[PDB]
Coordinates of C-alpha atoms and ligand atoms in Angstrom, one line a residue:
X1 CA 7.6 -22.9 -19.2
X2 CA 5.1 -21.6 -21.8
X3 CA 1.9 -19.5 -21.8
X4 CA -1.0 -20.9 -23.8
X5 CA -1.5 -19.4 -27.2
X6 CA -5.0 -18.5 -28.4
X7 CA -6.5 -17.5 -25.0
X8 CA -6.2 -14.9 -22.3
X9 CA -5.4 -15.5 -18.6
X10 CA -5.8 -12.6 -16.2
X11 CA -4.6 -12.2 -12.6
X12 CA -6.4 -9.6 -10.5
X13 CA -6.4 -9.2 -6.7
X14 CA -9.2 -11.0 -4.7
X15 CA -10.7 -7.8 -3.3
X16 CA -11.3 -6.3 -6.8
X17 CA -14.3 -6.9 -9.1
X18 CA -13.1 -10.1 -10.8
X19 CA -16.6 -11.3 -11.6
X20 CA -17.3 -8.0 -13.4
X21 CA -14.0 -8.4 -15.3
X22 CA -14.9 -11.9 -16.4
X23 CA -18.2 -10.6 -17.8
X24 CA -16.2 -8.2 -20.0
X25 CA -14.2 -11.4 -21.0
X26 CA -17.5 -13.0 -22.1
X27 CA -18.3 -10.1 -24.5
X28 CA -14.7 -10.5 -25.8
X29 CA -15.3 -14.2 -26.3
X30 CA -18.6 -13.6 -28.0
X31 CA -17.0 -11.3 -30.6
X32 CA -13.8 -13.2 -31.3
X33 CA -14.1 -16.8 -30.0
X34 CA -11.2 -16.1 -27.7
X35 CA -11.9 -17.3 -24.1
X36 CA -10.8 -15.0 -21.2
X37 CA -10.1 -16.6 -17.7
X38 CA -9.9 -14.4 -14.7
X39 CA -7.9 -15.8 -11.7
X40 CA -7.4 -14.2 -8.3
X41 CA -4.4 -16.0 -6.7
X42 CA -3.1 -15.0 -3.2
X43 CA 0.2 -13.0 -3.2
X44 CA -0.1 -12.5 -7.0
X45 CA 2.1 -9.5 -6.9
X46 CA 4.9 -11.7 -5.4
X47 CA 4.1 -14.8 -7.6
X48 CA 3.9 -12.9 -10.9
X49 CA 7.7 -12.0 -11.1
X50 CA 8.6 -15.5 -10.0
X51 CA 6.6 -17.4 -12.7
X52 CA 7.0 -14.6 -15.3
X53 CA 10.8 -14.9 -14.9
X54 CA 10.5 -18.5 -16.2
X55 CA 8.4 -17.3 -19.1
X56 CA 5.2 -18.5 -17.4
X57 CA 2.3 -16.8 -15.7
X58 CA -0.8 -14.8 -16.9
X59 CA -1.2 -12.8 -20.1
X60 CA -2.3 -9.8 -18.1
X61 CA -1.6 -8.8 -14.5
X62 CA -3.5 -6.3 -12.5
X63 CA -2.0 -4.3 -9.6
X64 CA -1.4 -0.8 -8.4
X65 CA 1.3 0.9 -10.4
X66 CA 4.0 1.0 -7.6
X67 CA 4.9 -2.7 -8.3
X68 CA 5.3 -2.2 -12.1
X69 CA 8.7 -0.5 -12.1
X70 CA 10.3 -3.6 -10.6
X71 CA 8.6 -5.8 -13.1
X72 CA 9.9 -3.7 -16.0
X73 CA 13.4 -3.6 -14.5
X74 CA 13.4 -7.4 -14.8
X75 CA 12.0 -7.3 -18.3
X76 CA 8.7 -9.0 -17.4
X77 CA 6.3 -6.5 -19.1
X78 CA 5.6 -5.7 -22.7
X79 CA 5.9 -2.0 -23.8
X80 CA 2.5 -0.6 -24.5
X81 CA 2.2 1.9 -27.4
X82 CA -1.4 3.3 -27.6
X83 CA -2.1 5.9 -30.2
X84 CA -2.7 9.6 -29.2
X85 CA -6.4 9.2 -29.6
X86 CA -6.6 6.5 -27.0
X87 CA -4.2 8.3 -24.6
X88 CA -6.5 11.3 -24.6
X89 CA -9.3 9.3 -23.1
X90 CA -7.4 8.8 -19.9
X91 CA -6.2 11.5 -17.5
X92 CA -2.5 12.4 -18.2
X93 CA -1.4 11.8 -14.6
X94 CA -2.6 8.2 -14.8
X95 CA -0.3 7.7 -17.8
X96 CA 2.5 9.3 -15.7
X97 CA 1.9 6.7 -13.0
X98 CA 2.7 3.9 -15.6
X99 CA 5.7 5.5 -17.3
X100 CA 9.1 4.0 -16.4
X101 CA 12.3 5.0 -18.2
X102 CA 10.3 6.9 -20.8
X103 CA 8.2 3.9 -21.7
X104 CA 4.5 3.1 -20.9
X105 CA 4.5 -0.3 -19.2
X106 CA 0.8 -0.7 -18.3
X107 CA -2.7 0.6 -18.9
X108 CA -4.1 2.7 -16.0
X109 CA -7.6 1.7 -14.8
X110 CA -8.5 3.5 -11.6
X111 CA -7.3 5.9 -8.9
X112 CA -7.4 4.3 -5.4
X113 CA -7.2 6.3 -2.2
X114 CA -8.0 5.4 1.4
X115 CA -10.9 7.3 3.1
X116 CA -12.4 7.4 6.6
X117 CA -15.6 5.3 6.7
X118 CA -18.0 5.9 9.6
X119 CA -21.2 4.5 10.9
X120 CA -23.9 7.3 10.9
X121 CA -26.0 5.6 13.6
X122 CA -23.0 5.4 16.0
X123 CA -21.3 8.7 15.1
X124 CA -23.2 11.1 12.8
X125 CA -20.5 13.8 13.1
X126 CA -17.1 12.1 12.6
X127 CA -13.9 13.7 14.0
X128 CA -11.7 15.9 11.8
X129 CA -8.6 15.2 13.8
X130 CA -6.7 12.0 14.9
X131 CA -6.1 13.7 18.3
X132 CA -9.8 13.4 19.3
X133 CA -10.1 9.7 18.6
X134 CA -8.9 8.6 22.1
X135 CA -11.8 10.5 23.8
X136 CA -14.3 9.0 21.3
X137 CA -13.0 5.5 22.0
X138 CA -13.2 6.0 25.8
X139 CA -16.9 7.0 25.5
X140 CA -17.8 4.2 23.0
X141 CA -16.0 1.5 25.0
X142 CA -18.3 2.2 27.9
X143 CA -21.1 1.4 25.4
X144 CA -19.4 -1.8 24.4
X145 CA -18.2 -0.4 21.0
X146 CA -14.9 1.1 19.7
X147 CA -14.0 4.3 17.8
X148 CA -11.7 3.0 15.0
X149 CA -10.5 -0.3 13.6
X150 CA -8.4 -0.9 10.4
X151 CA -5.7 -3.1 9.0
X152 CA -2.5 -2.5 10.9
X153 CA -0.7 -5.4 9.2
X154 CA -0.2 -3.5 5.9
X155 CA 1.8 -0.2 5.9
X156 CA -0.4 1.1 3.1
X157 CA -3.1 1.8 5.8
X158 CA -0.8 3.3 8.4
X159 CA 1.3 5.4 6.0
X160 CA -1.2 8.3 5.7
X161 CA -0.6 9.1 9.4
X162 CA 3.2 8.5 9.2
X163 CA 3.4 10.9 6.3
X164 CA 1.0 13.5 7.6
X165 CA 3.6 15.6 9.5
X166 CA 6.6 15.1 7.1
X167 CA 7.4 11.4 6.5
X168 CA 8.2 10.5 2.9
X169 CA 9.5 7.5 0.9
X170 CA 11.7 9.0 -1.8
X171 CA 11.5 12.8 -2.4
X172 CA 9.5 13.8 -5.4
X173 CA 11.4 16.3 -7.6
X174 CA 9.6 17.6 -10.7
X175 CA 8.1 14.2 -11.7
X176 CA 11.3 12.3 -10.7
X177 CA 12.0 10.6 -7.4
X178 CA 15.5 10.8 -5.9
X179 CA 16.6 7.5 -4.3
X180 CA 19.5 9.3 -2.6
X181 CA 17.0 11.0 -0.2
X182 CA 14.8 8.7 1.8
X183 CA 12.6 10.0 4.7
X184 CA 11.3 7.0 6.6
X185 CA 13.1 8.1 9.9
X186 CA 12.6 11.9 9.9
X187 CA 10.7 13.8 12.7
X188 CA 7.4 13.8 10.9
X189 CA 7.4 10.0 10.6
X190 CA 8.5 9.4 14.2
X191 CA 5.6 11.7 15.4
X192 CA 3.0 9.9 13.3
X193 CA 4.2 6.4 14.2
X194 CA 4.5 7.3 17.9
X195 CA 0.8 8.5 17.9
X196 CA -0.2 5.2 16.4
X197 CA 1.7 3.2 19.0
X198 CA 0.1 5.3 21.8
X199 CA -3.3 4.4 20.5
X200 CA -2.3 0.7 21.0
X201 CA -0.6 1.4 24.4
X202 CA -3.8 3.1 25.7
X203 CA -5.9 0.2 24.3
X204 CA -7.7 2.3 21.7
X205 CA -6.5 -0.2 19.0
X206 CA -5.1 -3.7 18.9
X207 CA -1.7 -4.3 17.2
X208 CA -3.0 -7.7 15.9
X209 CA -5.9 -6.1 14.0
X210 CA -5.9 -7.0 10.3
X211 CA -8.1 -6.5 7.2
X212 CA -10.5 -9.3 8.0
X213 CA -11.0 -8.3 11.7
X214 CA -11.6 -4.7 10.9
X215 CA -14.0 -5.4 8.1
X216 CA -16.1 -7.8 10.2
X217 CA -16.2 -5.4 13.2
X218 CA -17.4 -2.4 11.2
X219 CA -19.9 -4.4 9.1
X220 CA -21.5 -5.9 12.2
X221 CA -21.7 -2.4 13.7
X222 CA -19.2 -3.0 16.6
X223 CA -16.9 -0.1 15.7
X224 CA -17.9 3.5 14.6
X225 CA -15.1 4.0 12.1
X226 CA -12.7 2.2 9.7
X227 CA -10.1 3.1 7.0
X228 CA -10.4 1.4 3.7
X229 CA -10.7 1.9 -0.1
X230 CA -13.6 1.9 -2.6
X231 CA -13.4 -1.9 -3.1
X232 CA -14.7 -2.3 0.5
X233 CA -17.9 -0.2 0.0
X234 CA -19.6 -3.3 -1.6
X235 CA -19.6 -5.4 1.6
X236 CA -20.9 -2.5 3.6
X237 CA -23.8 -1.9 1.2
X238 CA -24.7 -5.6 1.9
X239 CA -24.5 -5.1 5.6
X240 CA -27.1 -3.2 7.7
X241 CA -24.8 -0.3 8.4
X242 CA -25.7 3.3 7.3
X243 CA -22.2 4.6 6.5
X244 CA -20.6 7.7 5.1
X245 CA -17.2 8.2 3.4
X246 CA -15.2 11.4 4.2
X247 CA -11.8 13.0 4.4
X248 CA -9.2 11.3 6.6
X249 CA -8.5 13.0 10.0
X250 CA -5.8 15.6 10.3
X251 CA -2.7 15.1 12.5
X252 CA -1.1 18.1 14.1
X253 CA -3.3 20.3 11.9
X254 CA -1.8 18.6 8.8
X255 CA -3.9 16.4 6.4
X256 CA -3.5 12.7 6.3
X257 CA -1.4 12.0 3.1
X258 CA -2.3 8.5 1.7
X259 CA -0.1 6.9 -0.9
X260 CA -2.4 6.9 -4.0
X261 CA -2.4 3.8 -6.2
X262 CA -3.4 3.7 -9.9
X263 CA -4.7 0.2 -10.5
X264 CA -2.9 -0.8 -13.7
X265 CA -3.0 -3.7 -16.3
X266 CA 0.4 -4.8 -17.6
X267 CA 1.1 -7.4 -20.4
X268 CA 3.4 -10.3 -19.7
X269 CA 6.4 -10.1 -22.0
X270 CA 6.4 -13.9 -22.4
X271 CA 2.8 -13.8 -23.7
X272 CA 2.1 -15.1 -27.2
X273 CA -1.2 -13.2 -27.1
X274 CA 0.0 -9.6 -26.9
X275 CA -2.2 -8.2 -29.7
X276 CA -5.3 -9.9 -28.2
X277 CA -4.4 -8.5 -24.8
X278 CA -4.2 -5.0 -26.1
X279 CA -7.5 -5.3 -28.0
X280 CA -9.2 -6.5 -24.8
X281 CA -7.8 -3.7 -22.6
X282 CA -8.2 -0.8 -25.0
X283 CA -11.5 -1.7 -26.6
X284 CA -13.4 -3.9 -24.1
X285 CA -12.3 -3.0 -20.6
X286 CA -11.4 0.7 -20.9
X287 CA -14.9 1.7 -22.1
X288 CA -17.9 3.1 -20.2
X289 CA -19.7 -0.3 -20.3
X290 CA -16.5 -2.3 -19.5
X291 CA -15.6 -0.4 -16.3
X292 CA -19.3 -0.2 -15.4
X293 CA -19.3 -4.0 -15.4
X294 CA -16.3 -4.1 -13.1
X295 CA -17.4 -1.2 -11.0
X296 CA -20.8 -2.9 -10.3
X297 CA -19.0 -6.0 -8.9
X298 CA -16.6 -3.9 -6.6
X299 CA -16.2 -0.1 -6.8
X300 CA -13.0 0.8 -8.6
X301 CA -13.0 4.4 -7.1
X302 CA -12.2 7.3 -9.4
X303 CA -11.5 5.8 -12.8
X304 CA -8.8 6.8 -15.3
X305 CA -11.3 7.0 -18.2
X306 CA -12.5 10.6 -18.4
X307 CA -15.9 9.8 -19.8
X308 CA -17.0 7.5 -17.1
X309 CA -15.3 9.4 -14.2
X310 CA -17.5 12.4 -15.0
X311 CA -20.5 10.2 -14.0
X312 CA -18.9 8.8 -10.9
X313 CA -17.7 12.2 -9.6
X314 CA -21.3 13.0 -8.5
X315 CA -21.3 10.2 -5.9
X316 CA -20.2 11.7 -2.5
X317 CA -18.1 8.6 -1.7
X318 CA -16.0 9.3 -4.9
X319 CA -15.8 13.0 -4.0
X320 CA -14.2 11.9 -0.7
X321 CA -11.9 9.4 -2.4
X322 CA -10.7 12.3 -4.6
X323 CA -10.3 14.7 -1.7
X324 CA -8.1 12.1 0.0
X325 CA -6.1 11.5 -3.2
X326 CA -5.5 15.2 -3.8
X327 CA -4.2 15.5 -0.2
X328 CA -2.0 12.4 -0.7
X329 CA 0.7 11.6 -3.2
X330 CA 0.7 9.2 -6.2
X331 CA 3.2 6.5 -5.4
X332 CA 6.6 6.2 -7.2
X333 CA 6.8 3.2 -9.5
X334 CA 10.6 2.8 -9.1
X335 CA 11.9 -0.8 -8.3
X336 CA 13.0 0.3 -4.8
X337 CA 9.3 0.5 -3.7
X338 CA 9.1 -3.2 -3.0
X339 CA 12.0 -3.1 -0.6
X340 CA 10.6 0.1 1.0
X341 CA 7.2 -1.4 1.6
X342 CA 8.7 -4.6 3.0
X343 CA 10.9 -2.5 5.2
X344 CA 8.1 -0.2 6.5
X345 CA 5.8 -3.3 7.0
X346 CA 8.4 -4.6 9.4
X347 CA 8.9 -1.3 11.2
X348 CA 5.2 -0.8 12.1
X349 CA 4.7 -4.4 13.1
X350 CA 7.7 -4.2 15.5
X351 CA 6.9 -0.8 17.0
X352 CA 3.2 -1.7 17.5
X353 CA 4.0 -5.1 19.1
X354 CA 6.8 -3.7 21.3
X355 CA 9.6 -5.8 19.8
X356 CA 11.3 -2.5 18.8
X357 CA 10.9 1.1 19.8
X358 CA 9.8 3.6 17.1
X359 CA 13.3 5.1 16.7
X360 CA 14.9 1.7 16.3
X361 CA 12.1 0.5 14.0
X362 CA 12.3 3.4 11.6
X363 CA 16.1 3.4 11.6
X364 CA 16.2 -0.2 10.4
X365 CA 13.6 0.8 7.8
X366 CA 15.8 3.8 6.7
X367 CA 18.7 1.3 6.2
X368 CA 16.6 -1.3 4.3
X369 CA 15.4 1.4 1.9
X370 CA 18.8 3.1 1.4
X371 CA 20.6 -0.1 0.6
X372 CA 19.4 -0.1 -3.1
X373 CA 21.2 3.2 -3.7
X374 CA 24.6 2.3 -2.1
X375 CA 24.5 -1.1 -3.8
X376 CA 24.0 0.6 -7.2
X377 CA 26.8 3.1 -6.5
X378 CA 29.3 0.3 -6.0
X379 CA 28.1 -2.1 -8.7
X380 CA 27.8 0.7 -11.2
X381 CA 31.4 1.9 -11.0
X382 CA 32.8 -1.6 -10.5
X383 CA 31.2 -2.7 -13.8
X384 CA 32.2 0.6 -15.5
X385 CA 35.8 0.3 -14.3
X386 CA 36.0 -3.3 -15.4
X387 CA 34.5 -2.8 -18.9
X388 CA 35.7 0.6 -20.1
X389 CA 38.6 3.1 -20.1
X390 CA 36.8 5.3 -17.5
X391 CA 39.0 6.8 -14.9
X392 CA 39.0 4.9 -11.6
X393 CA 38.1 7.8 -9.4
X394 CA 37.0 5.8 -6.3
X395 CA 40.6 5.5 -5.0
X396 CA 41.1 9.2 -5.9
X397 CA 38.4 9.9 -3.3
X398 CA 35.2 10.3 -5.4
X399 CA 32.5 8.7 -3.3
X400 CA 32.1 7.6 0.4
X401 CA 34.6 5.5 2.3
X402 CA 32.3 2.4 2.5
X403 CA 32.0 2.6 -1.3
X404 CA 35.7 3.1 -1.6
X405 CA 36.7 0.1 0.5
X406 CA 34.0 -2.1 -1.0
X407 CA 35.4 -1.3 -4.5
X408 CA 38.9 -2.1 -3.3
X409 CA 37.7 -5.4 -1.8
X410 CA 35.8 -6.1 -5.0
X411 CA 38.8 -5.5 -7.2
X412 CA 40.8 -8.1 -5.2
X413 CA 38.2 -10.8 -4.7
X414 CA 36.2 -10.1 -7.9
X415 CA 39.2 -10.2 -10.2
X416 CA 40.2 -13.5 -8.5
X417 CA 36.8 -15.0 -9.4
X418 CA 37.1 -13.8 -13.0
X419 CA 40.6 -15.2 -13.4
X420 CA 39.7 -18.6 -12.0
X421 CA 36.3 -19.1 -13.8
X422 CA 37.0 -17.6 -17.2
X423 CA 35.7 -20.7 -19.1
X424 CA 32.7 -21.1 -16.8
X425 CA 31.7 -17.4 -17.4
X426 CA 32.1 -17.9 -21.2
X427 CA 29.8 -20.9 -20.9
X428 CA 27.1 -19.1 -19.0
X429 CA 27.3 -16.0 -21.3
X430 CA 27.2 -18.2 -24.4
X431 CA 24.2 -20.0 -23.0
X432 CA 22.6 -16.5 -22.5
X433 CA 21.6 -14.6 -25.6
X434 CA 22.9 -11.2 -24.9
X435 CA 23.3 -8.8 -27.8
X436 CA 21.1 -5.9 -26.8
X437 CA 19.3 -4.1 -23.9
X438 CA 16.4 -6.5 -23.8
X439 CA 18.6 -9.5 -23.2
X440 CA 20.4 -7.8 -20.3
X441 CA 16.9 -7.9 -18.7
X442 CA 16.8 -11.6 -19.5
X443 CA 19.8 -11.9 -17.2
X444 CA 17.6 -10.4 -14.4
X445 CA 15.3 -13.4 -14.8
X446 CA 17.7 -16.3 -15.3
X447 CA 20.1 -15.5 -12.4
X448 CA 17.6 -15.6 -9.6
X449 CA 17.3 -19.3 -10.1
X450 CA 21.1 -19.6 -10.1
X451 CA 21.6 -17.1 -7.3
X452 CA 18.6 -17.3 -4.9
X453 CA 18.5 -21.1 -4.7
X454 CA 20.3 -22.3 -1.6
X455 CA 22.1 -20.4 1.1
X456 CA 23.5 -16.8 0.9
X457 CA 27.1 -15.7 1.5
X458 CA 29.4 -12.9 0.3
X459 CA 31.2 -15.3 -2.0
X460 CA 28.0 -16.0 -4.0
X461 CA 27.4 -12.3 -4.1
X462 CA 30.9 -11.4 -5.4
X463 CA 30.3 -14.1 -8.0
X464 CA 27.1 -12.4 -9.2
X465 CA 28.8 -9.0 -9.5
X466 CA 32.0 -10.5 -11.0
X467 CA 29.8 -12.3 -13.6
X468 CA 28.2 -8.9 -14.2
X469 CA 31.6 -7.3 -14.9
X470 CA 32.3 -10.2 -17.3
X471 CA 29.1 -9.4 -19.1
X472 CA 29.8 -5.7 -19.1
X473 CA 33.1 -6.4 -20.9
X474 CA 31.1 -8.3 -23.6
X475 CA 28.6 -5.4 -24.0
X476 CA 31.5 -2.9 -24.5
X477 CA 32.9 -5.4 -27.1
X478 CA 29.8 -5.4 -29.2
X479 CA 29.2 -1.6 -29.0
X480 CA 26.6 -1.8 -26.2
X481 CA 28.2 0.3 -23.5
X482 CA 24.8 1.9 -22.9
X483 CA 23.5 -1.3 -21.4
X484 CA 26.2 -1.5 -18.7
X485 CA 24.4 0.9 -16.4
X486 CA 21.0 -0.9 -16.9
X487 CA 22.8 -4.2 -16.4
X488 CA 24.2 -2.8 -13.1
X489 CA 20.6 -1.8 -12.1
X490 CA 19.3 -5.3 -12.9
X491 CA 22.0 -7.0 -10.7
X492 CA 21.4 -4.4 -8.0
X493 CA 17.7 -4.9 -8.1
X494 CA 17.8 -8.7 -8.2
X495 CA 20.3 -8.7 -5.3
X496 CA 18.8 -6.2 -2.9
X497 CA 15.2 -7.5 -3.1
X498 CA 16.2 -11.2 -3.0
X499 CA 18.7 -10.8 -0.1
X500 CA 17.2 -7.7 1.7
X501 CA 16.9 -9.3 5.1
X502 CA 20.3 -11.0 5.0
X503 CA 22.0 -7.9 3.7
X504 CA 20.4 -5.8 6.5
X505 CA 21.4 -8.5 9.0
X506 CA 25.1 -8.4 7.8
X507 CA 24.9 -4.5 7.9
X508 CA 25.1 -4.2 4.2
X509 CA 28.4 -3.2 2.5
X510 CA 30.2 -2.6 5.8
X511 CA 29.7 -6.3 6.5
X512 CA 31.1 -7.3 3.0
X513 CA 34.1 -5.0 3.7
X514 CA 34.6 -6.6 7.1
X515 CA 34.2 -10.2 5.9
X516 CA 37.3 -10.0 3.7
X517 CA 39.1 -7.2 5.4
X518 CA 41.4 -6.7 2.4
Ligands
LIG601 C1 29.0 -19.4 -14.1 C2 28.2 -18.2 -13.6 O1 27.9 -18.4 -12.2 C3 27.1 -17.6 -11.5 C4 26.6 -16.3 -12.0 C5 25.8 -15.6 -11.2 C6 25.5 -16.0 -9.9 C7 26.0 -17.2 -9.4 C8 26.8 -18.0 -10.2 O2 27.3 -19.2 -9.7 C9 26.7 -20.4 -10.1 C10 27.9 -21.4 -10.1 O3 27.7 -22.5 -9.6 N1 29.1 -21.1 -10.5 C11 30.3 -21.9 -10.6 C12 31.3 -21.1 -11.4 C13 31.8 -19.8 -10.7 C14 32.3 -20.1 -9.4 C15 31.3 -20.8 -8.5 C16 30.9 -22.1 -9.2 C17 32.9 -18.8 -8.7 C18 33.5 -18.9 -7.4 O4 34.5 -19.5 -7.2 N2 32.7 -18.5 -6.3 C19 33.2 -18.8 -4.9 C20 34.1 -17.7 -4.4 C21 33.7 -16.4 -4.2 C22 34.6 -15.5 -3.7 C23 35.9 -15.8 -3.4 C24 36.3 -17.1 -3.5 C25 35.5 -18.1 -4.0 C26 32.0 -18.9 -4.0 O5 31.0 -18.2 -4.3 N3 32.1 -19.6 -2.9 C27 31.1 -19.7 -1.8 C28 31.7 -19.9 -0.5 C29 32.5 -18.6 -0.1 C30 33.7 -18.3 -0.7 C31 34.4 -17.2 -0.3 C32 33.8 -16.3 0.7 C33 32.6 -16.6 1.2 C34 31.9 -17.8 0.9 C35 30.0 -20.8 -2.1 O6 29.0 -20.8 -1.5 N4 30.2 -21.6 -3.2 C36 29.2 -22.6 -3.6 C37 29.4 -24.0 -3.0 O7 28.4 -24.7 -2.9 N5 30.6 -24.6 -2.5 C38 31.9 -24.0 -2.5 C39 29.0 -22.7 -5.1 C40 28.4 -21.5 -5.6 C41 29.1 -20.4 -5.8 C42 28.6 -19.2 -6.3 C43 27.3 -19.1 -6.7 C44 26.5 -20.3 -6.6 C45 27.0 -21.5 -6.1 N6 26.8 -17.9 -7.2 C46 25.6 -17.7 -8.0
LIG602 O1 0.8 -2.5 2.3 C1 1.7 -2.3 1.3 C2 1.2 -2.5 -0.1 O2 0.4 -1.3 -0.4 C3 -0.2 -1.3 -1.7 O3 -1.1 -2.3 -1.7 C4 -2.5 -2.1 -1.7 C5 -3.1 -2.0 -3.1 O4 -2.6 -0.8 -3.8 C6 -4.6 -1.9 -3.1 O5 -5.2 -2.0 -4.4 C7 -5.3 -2.9 -2.1 O6 -5.3 -4.2 -2.7 O7 -4.7 -2.9 -0.8 C8 -3.2 -3.1 -0.9 C9 -2.8 -3.2 0.6 O8 -3.2 -4.4 1.2 C10 0.8 -1.5 -2.7 O9 0.2 -1.4 -4.0 C11 1.6 -2.7 -2.5 O10 2.7 -2.8 -3.5 C12 2.2 -2.8 -1.1 O11 2.8 -4.0 -0.9

């Protein structure tokens, strides 16, 4: 619909210091008359791209940087353009976290990493290895306690162990991440996940443990250890637990490697308050007194602002956060991440419960994460074939056989669709406002309403791609060939994330090829 002009609405996760952030809003209001309203809706990272796609939602959205690439792919975020003087106040690697396609798409706030939190009056000398946690639990269970409890429902918490001995999402390569090479099902990951499942099999942990259960158990003193981030420290300070924060245990001699998030603030593209949003973020929040105000509600961890981080670095809890972050890896921000997470979430839940074995669970995850790449391979060269004088090399034997037969199929069925629905395609394109690269993103938004609503079948999918080819022809026509590849990425993103389960159910492009058997 429409975002309200002349005020700021902010969405931040319910575990962060939202009250502290609203106090920064009060100072902003005092100085300007502009009211700032902080909201903490459930599933805001899932809701944001739904409401933002219809030109609605908050002015500012807070989340870890990994989600932001997807938002930017669908044109939901304003480009941010701070001057050099302001960029110098934050650590360069935080700015890297929020750079997508050579554009800054958010303001970095804080560096979040998981640590091992332990009760000093149950266990003054915590274990340096995962391997020694079973023996600790055996001893503590005879005392009516347990060794370790943490959220097994979110793969963010289990990933440090899965990655320890070689598991990886998409291989880092000199700042860049190659989607061609995914490592969710390599030996390192199997070993890590197997060890977790053994803990559950031998009753050292419970597969149904979640954030709420773990937090309560630790804060009541029922378990000697938990895994959590700086935001959690606040509720422990309130409890009667003398706790420490330290490096995560090693696995097979190898450090636990958490995926490190940079909590970031992005500006809704549909906002009529962009200049106010930037003024708030640069000049009220990202100051010593601004972050102090948020930090005092719930610890942010290590902060992106150099001046204030220097003060925090003295706290031993922050030293531990940083030790864990340096041993981990900063997450990619690419649009694939969402699918990857959802895929790994399913794998751990199934392996832990018994529903699948570890090998079967990681295999399905490997597929669910790969799909984005193969999809893009096919859609890219279909659109390019259709729109331009490029050589049609797929039949000449350029890419894999699945891509080859998918393209052949698509040439037959897709061209049929374009022949028969010429006027309908003209009508939809004319209703769209496509003359540039920004507007190609506006397709990303619109179509999910047209595409996602209702059932899913290959027919509807061919229609989406076929319409994409029709739009690519238009782009070529108005000297905009450079948008065809971004257009293909939009379609591919919109499709894979929206129909991930179904696509995996159908066995991806092999299914498509089968369905029509051209
Ligand atoms: C005008 C731009 O249209 C779209 C652009 C991007 C995404 C979409 C667009 O379609 C909206 C629409 O109503 N566009 C109109 C203008 C384009 C037109 C569809 C209608 C294109 C078309 O013929 N699509 C047909 C089709 C596709 C491939 C081969 C033969 C037929 C289609 O999607 N039919 C399927 C049934 C089907 C057909 C063949 C194999 C498997 C399943 C369907 O589900 N059909 C649905 C149904 O309720 N009963 C048959 C209707 C439907 C079809 C496709 C979609 C949505 C609804 N795709 C989403
Ligand atoms: O579990 C997958 C989940 O991991 C990360 O979410 C973290 C977030 O970064 C933290 O700030 C905190 O809120 O805990 C979350 C896990 O419950 C990713 O950022 C997220 O995209 C992903 O779904």
